[PDB]
Every structure is written in structure tokens, then in C-alpha cells.
Design a protein around this ligand. Structure first.
Ligand SMILES: [Mg+2]
Ligand SMILES: [Mg+2]
Ligand SMILES: [Mg+2]
Ligand SMILES: [Mg+2]
Ligand SMILES: [Mg+2]
Ligand SMILES: [Mg+2]
Ligand SMILES: [Mg+2]
Ligand SMILES: [Mg+2]
Ligand SMILES: [Mg+2]
Ligand SMILES: [Mg+2]
Ligand SMILES: [Mg+2]
Lengths: 132, 138, 51
RNA sequence: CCCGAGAAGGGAGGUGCAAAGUGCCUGAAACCUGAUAGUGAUGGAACGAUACGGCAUGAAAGGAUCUCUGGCAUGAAGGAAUCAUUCGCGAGGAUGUAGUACGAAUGUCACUGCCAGUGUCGUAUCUUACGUUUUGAAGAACGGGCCAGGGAGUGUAUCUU
RNA sequence: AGCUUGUAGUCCGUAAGGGAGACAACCCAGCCCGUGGUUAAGGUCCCCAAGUGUCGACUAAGUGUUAAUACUAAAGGGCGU
RNA sequence: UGGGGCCCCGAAAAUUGACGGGGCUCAAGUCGACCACCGAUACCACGGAGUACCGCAAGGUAAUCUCGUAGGAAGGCGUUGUGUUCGGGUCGAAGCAGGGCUGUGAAGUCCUGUGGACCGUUCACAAACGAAAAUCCUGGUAAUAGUAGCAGCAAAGCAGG
RNA sequence: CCCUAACUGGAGUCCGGUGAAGCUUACAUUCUAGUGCACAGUCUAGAGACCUCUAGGGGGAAGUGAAGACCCCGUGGAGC
């Protein structure tokens, strides 16, 4: 429960990334829907005659660095608070809640995750995953 | 309601097609057999007899014989009728030969630019004569 | 001779199957690195000098 | 205990933290059966990409000055409508109004509770699959019915950088 | 000969997007992403966004409505106009 | 009589059909000019990403950077294991089906359900290290399909119990 | 054969039981013309087309069977 420490330049960059990553395509592999053997991850087109590798606008969008998010707000949570994957209670003593927010480890049991959330609530660090 | 007496077939068809693609009005085209087609009568009848006896019997173009259905066909050509816009436009178009009973006393509007007296020759035949020479009864 | 002590030979063409080596008395493929039970193409050698 | 002709099998019931219920750990896809959502017996095909809508979902992990609707301030590129004058055979042009009102976006104040997303369908534009041999592939050229797993620059010696 | 063999330039191969109905190499154009604007080629009767546009003539044959082109018929003739 | 524009005859092909189609006649055709508009990812502008070189660094410049096959170069993602640092787990590990978020992406992380015992990470290092395809190999399984066959050379069965 | 007809038994058709295989990247209700490696159900422009099922014989899918056995090439073989 704290105000996000983001200056108006970074607020504009955050909204810019919101719009531009709303418009960003999913970058599925070519012909992934046709065959059930194929996955949803990106593989570079390689055939000499393939229409995606030839950059047909009707066939999709090629993976390329022009689509990248703004450099300042890159890697930030959609809430804006930066993410720190917390895999232990000792990682709460090297993060400050003024502009960040933790993410508790998936394999953590209730016994130590309860202690983690208690220490975060007393310290003030924002937590993305929890229960209520 | 369009009175197609003394109007060019293609110009009337293009005007009605654009009006129906505006997309609100049901257009009735009475007196469809009195529409005009420019050109010599021999060439007009030659083209229409070639187009009449064209297709195959299982597949081919079953080009109509009635004057109202020929005018409907010509307006069908200038529409995207295989699309939903074209299908709605063709459902919102009715062509009649003569005056049907429900259109007696109704109000009509005729296209100025599609008039037949804008032409400058005697070379024309009516759509009714072409339908009649295609074997139609109307 | 892991995967290699077989005596398999290809069937040639004209049978609708691929050209890989197969057993002399059955159609089961053998001895090639992509056949089941075939030799590891480029496996480690005991004569390598890792030092 | 019941059905069943039945040492089959099924239901009820119990042991077991858990049926894990006799090739029985977890238990994928292909394939098959049923249910839910959308559409559907007037309908055009590389099954998708982009934009906008209908229906269903949207609990968690996504947003809460976030979603919807307006006012005000600054507004890059561009730039009117209307009216007046004058020219032009005419369609129209020039001048002024006016670089005005507007205008992407950047801020701020109200207003609102949905929005991002997911599934399917429709509408508008674009695309005749993938790999290979090819000068040229959607090819009436070759390979694949589908799914899972296995499947191709490795070592010794020697020379060079 | 959409044949074969050269040369200069530019292309496809390895070239998107926009337009020629579709078009490897013809025109604009060489192209990081999103938004706004204006133009290029080409088009503005409908299919299809924008002209049933203006001026001066021609064509009466549905000729034509086909830049380049492997996709488009000649010699000859016409008191057709 | 000569020189010109358009048109006509010359002009016959095999599935019905091609000005792209409808159609069009002072044109929706041809010729000589003209006006206004439409129309790209081009050009302009704004915001953003990457790259090139320079700068100690902040950062600076790019009209004179941004397409790409064979191919060269650089930087990263992933699997398995070793040394080493820091760890997670019956208050529920791996794996599996779906979904949210981040990243240009390789992929990572998170949530829901199931599960019943192991699993990662820092800095480095190795490899039996990544599949979509080889009429590829092994296994499972479709469509064909409740179809062909259950006939031809010896057509054999019916009543009662 | 002109010129086919009728009849018989077994199939087929229909029904009960049993019950495989071969083609298959995907979609697919097509027809014409053009274009495209010059032989297109999928492109382009038109024309048709409500869907499902049964029987039919085989027009098309350059139908399936199959790394062409004719011709050429290989500093490939064998026999003579
Ligand atoms: Mg073995
Ligand atoms: Mg090549
Ligand atoms: Mg594998
Ligand atoms: Mg050129
Ligand atoms: Mg080039
Ligand atoms: Mg092009
Ligand atoms: Mg390369
Ligand atoms: Mg595989
Ligand atoms: Mg029988
Ligand atoms: Mg061969
Ligand atoms: Mg030689």
C-alpha cells in the first residue's frame, strides 16, 4: 500500500508501452494451427519459398527488434511495480517497496509463504501473488 | 419506386445499384420492359442471343428471359451480391413489368442522367423487345 | 559395436518402404543411428583424451 | 446385501491419507464417446493476420486516475467550412477570412464500472500450405494419414591461423 | 520460337507494401514498430474510395473499353465519315 | 489529285465465357488539353525499438543507418551433468491440461486442477545437448467402414421331442 | 453378329451375426475462361450451388499400386 514512485517521463513511457504492447502480435510459429504436432513458440522461417519468411503482410509479423518495449519501463509489471522473484525470506532484506513489488516462489509451501507475506506486510513490499 | 420508361439500361442499373448500396430503401422498378438499350438492333439481339444460349444445362449461366428479371440481373451484376451487402441489396430490389396492382397510385422518381433522350441517335431497342425476341412472355 | 553387430541389409526400392538396413528375416530396421536400437552416431570414445 | 444362468460383470457398501482395485505410480497426444459455448440445412475453400461488432466467459494469476463518456490547457506534420473580391469559355483557381476554428499526443478536472484477455460467429482488406529440387512451386514435381518418443559436424594423429 | 549464344544497365534469385483481373523479375517503392497527414504509380458510372468532371472534335463498328509485354492479325481496298 | 484521323471489308476452330464482370454511344470508347479529388509501410511529423561510430561517463550524431537466399561475424534462450555460492519441498517436489504477466524472441515466472518425492539458482565448466520433414525408425491409432470377404470347384436341410 | 430377349443357379440389392485392407499435408458442393514451370476443385473474373442418405457404372482428382524396366548421365557394376 504505497504510491508508485514513477516520474511523469516514466509514466508516459509506461502508457506508451501499454498501447504498443497491446498492439503487439503474438508471434506464433508459421502453420502452427494446421498441424497438432507444432507448438505455439516462435521458430524462424527457413524455407526459400515460405510466405512468412518473405514477409507477406497477410501471413503475420516477423520477430524483430522494432517491436521492442521502451527501455525505461521494460520488464515492469502491468501494475507498474517492478518484479523481484522471491525464492526465500532472505531476499526481502534487499528490496525496497518504494517502486518495486515481490513475486513469491511457486514451490513455496504455506508454512514459509505465510512468514514471507507477514514480513512483507510489516516491511511494506508489494506482493503480487497471495491469498485472502 | 423508379419508373424505367425511356431510360438507359446500364445507367439506370448503375444508379439503382449505388442507391441500394447506400443501404436503406426498397427500390421498385416498374415498366421494366420499356427500358432502352443503345446500339444497333442487330448487334443488341446478337449479343443477347449469344448470352441467352451460353451455359451448360447442369452448370451454365441460366440467363433469364423476362424483362424484369433481365433488369434485375443487370442490377445484380453491378453489386457485390455474393456478399451480405449484395444479398441485402438484391433482397431490397423488386422489378416489375408494367404496373403491379399495389403500385397503382404510388409516387415515382425517374433518373435524370439515365434518360434516353440524352442519346443522339435512333439506334436503340427496348428491353421488352429483347426479352420478347428471347422467347419471353410478359 | 553397440547397435552394429547385426547383419542387416537394405531392401532396395520397389517395396514402398524406406532404404534403411533391415533384418534378413524380418522388416525391422537395424544398425543405423535413427533405427530403433541402432548405433549412436558420434558417441563418446574411451580413447578420447580429456586431460 | 441386490441384479445376473454365472467364482464373469454391475450397483450398494467397506479397507486405504490416496483406488493406486491385480502389466494396478504419475497417466500426455493421436483416436473414440458425451456435455457446454458459438454458428448451422442460401452456402466458397490454405482454415490465418489486422480492425470493428453479436453471443458465452473473465474466481486466481492482469488494470482501479484502470474502463466508459465529456470540459479545460499546450498542441508537431497538415488545415478547413462559410462569406467577400477578382480571374477563368468552363470544371475551378488566386487573394482575404486564416496558418484561424481544428488536429496525433502530452497534462489536469469531472463522469462512469467496466476493460485487457479467452472461446466461437459475422462484417471489411490481404494471403493459392510447409520443407526440398528448382532460373522459376499452390503445382497436374518430390516427402509427410495422425500423435508420442529415437534420429544427423564425433574422436585420434598431424599442419595452419 | 516463352529458341540458342553474347554484351551495357537494372531486376528476380534473395524483394515486402501499393497498382496493373490474376502476373518471380512491368510502374510507384526499396521495408524497424504505433499514430496522424499528404502524395507516388494508377484510377474516379457500379462491382470499388474518389468525377454520370470541363473544354474542342472524332467513332456507329459493342470497333473500343489491352502502357511494357511470350498476353495485341497482315498485304490490299473503301463515292464509310 | 496529294497528305492525314477514326472506322469498315479482308477476318474461319473446335466444353458455354471473358473489356477483369455488369454495362456503356455529344460515352463509361479514341484524340488534343485542363480542373478537382481518391490512393502506399514512399515523403513529412510525433512517440518508441535496434544498430553503426565517437565520448571516461552522462550522452552525441545518422538526408548521407534499418529488406534479404548461399555464407561470414557477434550476442543470447533451453536440456543433462560437474566444481562452487545461495536455496525450495508431504503446511506438498518433479511431470501433466488450461490460463495471467514479462520479454522483439528463444523462453522465464506466476495461478487453477491432478500428483505423491524430489527440485533449482550465482559464478564457471563439459556434453550421448534442442526436430516438422530423411518413400526416416519403434509404438499407439484413425478415415476407408460396420464396407469387402464369410458365394463360383460337392447350391442341404425340414418336422417333432 | 444383324439385335437382342426370356429363363435357371450363385453373387449383387434388403435384413440378422461376424468383420479386415489399400490411396490420405490441409480444406473441399462445383462449372467455364484466363493466369501460373506453358495440363487449376483451392489463384483471378464470372456462373451456379439448401443439406443428408441409398443404388449405379466409372467422366475427373494429370485416381492407387512403384525411387521408370525406354533415352541420357555416373572417370558405378556384372556377364560375355
Ligand atoms: Mg542398444
Ligand atoms: Mg537456388
Ligand atoms: Mg524428439
Ligand atoms: Mg527492370
Ligand atoms: Mg535485388
Ligand atoms: Mg509486387
Ligand atoms: Mg545466412
Ligand atoms: Mg516427430
Ligand atoms: Mg446369402
Ligand atoms: Mg529415379
Ligand atoms: Mg567425369
Amino acid at each position: 500500500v504505497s504510491t508508485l514512485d514513477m516520474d511523469p517521463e516514466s509514466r508516459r513511457l509506461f502508457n506508451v508501452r501499454k498501447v504498443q504492447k497491446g498492439k503487439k502480435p503474438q508471434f506464433k510459429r508459421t502453420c502452427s494451427h494446421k498441424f497438432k504436432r507444432l507448438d505455439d513458440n516462435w521458430r524462424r522461417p527457413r524455407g526459400s519459398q515460405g510466405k512468412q519468411r518473405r514477409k507477406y503482410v497477410s501471413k503475420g509479423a516477423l520477430v524483430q527488434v522494432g517491436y521492442g518495449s521502451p527501455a525505461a519501463v521494460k520488464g515492469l509489471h502491468p501494475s507498474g511495480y517492478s518484479d523481484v522473484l522471491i525464492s526465500s525470506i532472505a531476499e526481502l532484506e534487499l528490496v525496497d517497496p518504494s517502486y518495486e513489488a515481490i513475486r513469491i516462489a511457486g514451490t513455496i509451501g504455506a508454512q514459509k509463504k505465510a512468514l514471507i507475506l507477514a514480513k512483507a506486510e510489516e516491511a511494506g513490499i508489494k506482493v503480487l501473488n497471495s491469498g485472502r | 419506386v423508379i419508373d424505367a420508361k425511356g431510360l438507359i439500361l446500364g445507367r439506370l442499373a448503375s444508379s439503382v445499384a449505388k442507391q441500394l448500396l447506400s443501404g436503406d430503401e426498397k427500390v421498385y422498378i416498374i415498366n421494366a420492359e420499356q427500358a432502352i438499350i443503345s446500339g444497333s438492333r442487330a448487334a443488341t439481339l446478337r449479343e443477347y442471343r449469344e448470352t441467352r444460349e451460353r451455359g451448360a444445362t447442369e452448370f451454365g449461366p441460366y440467363f433469364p428471359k423476362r424483362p424484369d428479371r433481365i433488369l434485375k440481373r443487370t442490377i445484380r451484376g453491378m453489386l457485390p451480391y455474393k456478399r451480405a451487402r449484395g444479398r441485402d441489396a438484391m433482397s431490397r430490389l423488386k422489378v416489375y413489368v408494367g404496373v403491379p396492382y399495389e403500385l397503382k397510385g404510388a409516387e415515382t422518381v425517374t433518373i435524370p442522367d439515365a434518360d434516353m433522350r440524352l442519346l443522339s441517335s435512333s439506334r436503340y431497342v427496348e428491353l421488352g423487345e429483347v426479352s420478347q425476341k428471347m422467347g419471353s412472355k410478359f | 559395436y553397440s547397435g552394429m553387430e547385426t547383419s542387416a541389409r537394405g531392401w532396395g526400392s520397389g517395396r514402398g518402404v524406406s532404404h534403411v538396413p533391415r533384418l534378413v528375416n524380418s522388416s525391422r530396421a537395424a544398425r543405423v543411428p535413427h533405427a530403433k536400437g541402432g548405433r549412436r552416431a558420434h558417441p563418446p570414445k574411451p580413447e578420447a583424451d580429456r586431460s
